[PDB]
Ligand binder design. Structure first.
Ligand SMILES: CS(=O)(=O)N1CCC(O)CC1
Length: 93
């Protein structure tokens, strides 16, 4: 059975107006801004941006890759696909 989400989990993250996007649950660094209650820090591969999202918008990567892991025109997406597949736990600072 599933556990709750935890830092390092790989997902497709969905925001309004964007296709399901390769992403990870981030850690919060000591001294860094924490997300709101009930939200996780989501690092989106390719664009390297963070947003705060709840589980409803988070699709586990293994299960979802066959549907969502196809090239997309949007900026950063295809770079994103390479990252999540090839070095999803790397520092992208
Ligand atoms: C799916 S995306 O384009 O990487 N996206 C992440 C950050 C958000 O605020 C909007 C842009």
């Amino acid at each position: 059975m599933p556990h709750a989400f935890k830092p390092g989990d790989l997902v497709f993250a969905k925001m309004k107006g964007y296709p399901h996007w390769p992403a990870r649950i981030d850690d919060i660094a000591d001294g860094a801004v924490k997300p709101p209650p009930n939200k996780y820090p989501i690092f989106f591969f390719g664009t390297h941006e963070t947003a705060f999202l709840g589980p409803k918008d988070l699709f586990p990567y293994d299960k979802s890759k066959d549907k969502y892991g196809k090239p997309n025109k949007r900026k950063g997406f295809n770079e994103g696909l390479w990252e999540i597949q090839n070095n999803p736990h790397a520092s992208y600072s």
